[PDB]
Amino acid sequence: KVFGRCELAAAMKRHGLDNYRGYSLGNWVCAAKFESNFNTQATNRNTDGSTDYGILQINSRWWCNDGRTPGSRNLCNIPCSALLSSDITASVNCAKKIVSDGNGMNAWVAWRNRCKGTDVQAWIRGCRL
């Protein structure tokens, strides 16, 4: 599924991402745009053999099991394929664990380089929330 901007904001808010660990909703929408172009089916291979999955590009090195990242962990206790679903529940719940781990939203490279220090409220402007 490829989400619209306000559609995704509404879904993220419903699952409790708005102000989660101090990060306003605009931060999460900005991250999703630049990580995946709002596409739940996005995948990208890293040089070390791991793969990033779904709307927030969660990495198979630590967070999910894809059966081909030897000696990896599965800390969200899910198959990586669950992160590609039209329903974003699994992605949101795993992201909550990631952002809580000490490094905050700096875990998402596109957020650090393209969203951090900008007017992130602009990403939810116009939406009925």
Ligand X SMILES: C[C@@H](O)CN1CCN(CC(=O)O)CCN(CC(=O)O)CCN(CC(=O)O)CC1
What is the dihedral angle through the alpha carbons of 11, 13, 19, 24, rounded to the nearest 10 degrees? 70
Structure tokens at 77: 């206790």
Out of 7, 87, 101, 119, the only residue in the binding site for Cl ion (CB under 5 A) is: 87
**24 vs 41 by CB, closer to Cl ion:** 24
Residues assigned a catalytic role = 35, 52
Convert 79-103 to b/e letters by CB count within 10 Å (16 or more is b).
bbebbbeeebebbbebbeebbeeee
101 binds, among ligand X, Cl ion, none (CB under 5 to 8 A by kind): ligand X
Q: Was 101 annotated as part of a binding site? A: yes
Among residues 8 and 64, whose Cβ is nearest to ligand X?
A: 64
Of 10-18, 50-58, 75-83, 109-117, the window that binds Cl ion (rule: CB under 5 A) is 10-18
* Non-local CB neighbours of 103 within 8 Å, separated by 6+ positions: none
Among Cl ion, ligand X, none, the one that 102 touches (CB under a kind-dependent 5 to 8 A) is ligand X
Binding-site size, Cl ion (CB under 5 A): 11
Return left, alpha or beta for 38; rule: phi > 0 is left, psi -120 to 50 is alpha, else beta: left
- List interacting residues with Cl ion (CB under 5 A): 11, 24-26, 67, 69, 72, 87-88, 104, 121
